[PDB]
Design a protein around this ligand. Sequence first.
Ligand SMILES: [K+]
Ligand SMILES: [K+]
Ligand SMILES: [K+]
Ligand SMILES: [Mg+2]
Ligand SMILES: [Mg+2]
Ligand SMILES: [Mg+2]
Ligand SMILES: [Mg+2]
Ligand SMILES: [Mg+2]
Ligand SMILES: [Mg+2]
Ligand SMILES: [Mg+2]
Ligand SMILES: [Mg+2]
Ligand SMILES: [Mg+2]
Ligand SMILES: [Mg+2]
Ligand SMILES: [Mg+2]
Ligand SMILES: [Mg+2]
Ligand SMILES: [Mg+2]
Ligand code: NA
Lengths: 212, 56, 100, 102
Amino acid sequence: GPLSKKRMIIRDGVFYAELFEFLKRELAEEGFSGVSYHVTTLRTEIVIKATKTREVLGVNGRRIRELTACIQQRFNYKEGKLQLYVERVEVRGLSAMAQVESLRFKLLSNLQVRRAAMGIIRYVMESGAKGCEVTVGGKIKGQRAKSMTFRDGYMIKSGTAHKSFVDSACRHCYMRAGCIGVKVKIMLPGDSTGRNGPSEPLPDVITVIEPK
Amino acid sequence: GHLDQWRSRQKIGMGKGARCCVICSNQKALIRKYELNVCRQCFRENAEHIGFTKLR
Amino acid sequence: MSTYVPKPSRDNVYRFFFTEGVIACKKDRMGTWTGTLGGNTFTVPCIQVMQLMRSLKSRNLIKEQYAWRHYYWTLNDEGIAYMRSYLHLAPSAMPNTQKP
Amino acid sequence: GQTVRLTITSRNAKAVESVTSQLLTRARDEKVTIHGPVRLPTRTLKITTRKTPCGNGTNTWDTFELKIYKRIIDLHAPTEQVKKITSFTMESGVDVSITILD
RNA sequence: GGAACUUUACCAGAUCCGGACAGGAUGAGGAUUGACAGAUUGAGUGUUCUUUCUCGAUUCCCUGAAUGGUGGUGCAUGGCCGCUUAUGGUCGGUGGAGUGAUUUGUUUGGUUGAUUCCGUCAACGGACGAGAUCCAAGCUGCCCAGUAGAAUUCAGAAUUGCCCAUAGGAUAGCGCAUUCGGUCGAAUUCUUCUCUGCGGGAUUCCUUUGUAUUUGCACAAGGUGAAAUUUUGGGCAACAGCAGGUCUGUGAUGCUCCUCAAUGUUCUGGGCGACACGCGCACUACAAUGUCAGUGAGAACAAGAAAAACGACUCGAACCUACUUGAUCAAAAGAGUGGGGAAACCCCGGAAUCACAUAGACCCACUUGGGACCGAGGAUUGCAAUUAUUGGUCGCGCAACGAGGAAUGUCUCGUAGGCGCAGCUCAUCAAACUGUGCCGAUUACGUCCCU
Ligand SMILES: [K+]
Ligand SMILES: [K+]
Ligand SMILES: [K+]
Ligand SMILES: [Mg+2]
Ligand SMILES: [Mg+2]
Ligand SMILES: [Mg+2]
Ligand SMILES: [Mg+2]
Ligand SMILES: [Mg+2]
Ligand SMILES: [Mg+2]
Ligand SMILES: [Mg+2]
Ligand SMILES: [Mg+2]
Ligand SMILES: [Mg+2]
Ligand SMILES: [Mg+2]
Ligand SMILES: [Mg+2]
Ligand SMILES: [Mg+2]
Ligand SMILES: [Mg+2]
Ligand code: NA
């Protein structure tokens, strides 16, 4: 043998990291937004978050069963011991992973960088985010590489609280000239529900309750 | 006998040549603590998913 | 190892590939790949599985995905038709990923 | 008299405390004898590595830490009753192990 | 990036195709694969020949294009990191001012580490950065312990009073005397110590026959207190950039180079370690605030074993360690018997700096300082130890070095310095790094002379 708790935690983390990488590469064009797994004695239940759940499932769940076969064979799960579920993200514009994939798709379609980046920002700010900051870099215009950033609204950079209020994701775009990096940051609106927003007040914001 | 010679030393399974990153299969600067077997550069990218955090 | 794939080993891999529409194999030349075919386990070297799947991919019969030293080959509709003719199965035969 | 030990282990402090409290409340509902819960020492997995991918620049380091929280609850209850107490939905990342003390 | 092989990218050779696929030849009257023996050979390597067997349609033969590459180009790139830059910096909107580039905002004054605040004001409103947030450490509450302990009862066992040493000082005690973690005793009672999830606690809070004071923002001493100023130490850290580094992390990547006697891949052997020399960092010293020999008391972070495989039939073994033997005679070994998945075994974690009224040896000398170089024996890790792998033993010590010119590094409190220990690299090897604890100061708490 029984592995120690340290070894068990390391093993579980490595399993999640490999599962995340496999789904990130497999579901790149379906707006993959995250993955969580719940382990019981009966089965291991894996829930995939995506924007286009129809493409993640496929006809009669052909795609989702193919992904189940991949995970089951790689990790040697037995029959009936592994299950996959697909749920949609409530707000796509508040997911950095979904938006950075959308930006990469738009760039791969020969769209201008200014157009695609501003399109992402307008969509994100319409979704209720406090702020969005997307940046595109590398061989944008010609042989010399330059980096250009587009931002709107609020954004916190320092401290440890931005790990909770800021959603980030970076992707590589493979163009004819070379590799283009796209990074999208979303300032999540603090919402009392934990699905979209840390639900905590901002670390430096002080509110005085109005008297009765 | 070229099948017996082929990768005969790699079958011994000792030293840095027998070990590689579980992500990138590189045989240099391998983190073997807690049986991670992950390259140092690959660990910095995947540390958040594995569960490690930067605190102090 | 040797890339030369015995014909019975190819038939076993293809039968497994059709039964479970996905094959996952670690990319290590001196490694062994294990699969289950209607009970029991048959072993093929990982390099030979890689060779068979590389041939299929060059003919656009499968889709290949790679992550963390592992391949993930999935039969395509053309690949399903190819395996159904190769394995001499009935037209009603389908991989488990397509059964209701 | 059978004594059964429940070990709750996770790397999330909030999850392990929530599971422990739920187990404790359910165990008190079946009015069984409780010993604990005991907050065992929390272990910090520590990995320090260079920040640069190359070898250039000031030798700066990143200290990554993983904390493991473990709790033990001893129950004087039959295996059927301890299964009933355990029978609920737990948070993800929390490992609960059941063992019968010698 | 502590390279024996591998790693490895270099050198001398020798294999394999890991050239998919397509098109065209041959082709079950056989496309092809693999080999015993004897030669070739570094090879008891079918790599090639002689010789035939073997496998069967997977290949092979030719053209194209693919593939792989620690090949180039970091001056084509992504990502990451470093640096400018540890300081207090940065940017719109609308408004004002200029033909404009631009400017105001963003400020003369005081204050703060702070573009931190208070005032002032052609601005007003905001956004970052600073602060706040976060993680540890110090004090503390609740909760908690068959993985931490304590106290008290009985029961067992031990010392027990006259004693003053080879010369024997100084240092508490003067209703019930102490001690025994194997006494591998048995029961009650508890959380003081330990463990810890969420809390509490500190903020210029209180004072001043202080400073400064229209005010304000504040400062200095002293209280309170575990802690008295960003509590302490870290992490994070804007906007602009640099042709800084990385194509030797990746199935990151454009172009280009090689591609079947290959720059792919594997195997054998060398090299990365070579030494008239120069330079940067570290270790050990030059001794008596010492070296030996003995004895005592005594930490904290931490690490520990395996599979879709091997044997039994889910379990065992790998990893760490304790105890015992080896031992009717060196170390290092070698062996058993247990334990530990790690608050459970190691472990009451007997670290050494340190201490010793040890009545110990040495006595100022390159000397019992120093331990570099080198010689013989033996053991261990490994498939392989020669170019000593690494310990252990006896020798060498006559190798310099007796405190180091000009120059130069780091540092303000549990800090410098000194001392070890663990992790990490790791089959074996630490003078490295990342942490940890132990003994613990001098000096200043200032300035803009130098940078
Ligand atoms: K004007
Ligand atoms: K600047
Ligand atoms: K010696
Ligand atoms: Mg801020
Ligand atoms: Mg800060
Ligand atoms: Mg070699
Ligand atoms: Mg490469
Ligand atoms: Mg550069
Ligand atoms: Mg760059
Ligand atoms: Mg200005
Ligand atoms: Mg000042
Ligand atoms: Mg000022
Ligand atoms: Mg590496
Ligand atoms: Mg070198
Ligand atoms: Mg000496
Ligand atoms: Mg080093
Ligand atoms: Na390149």
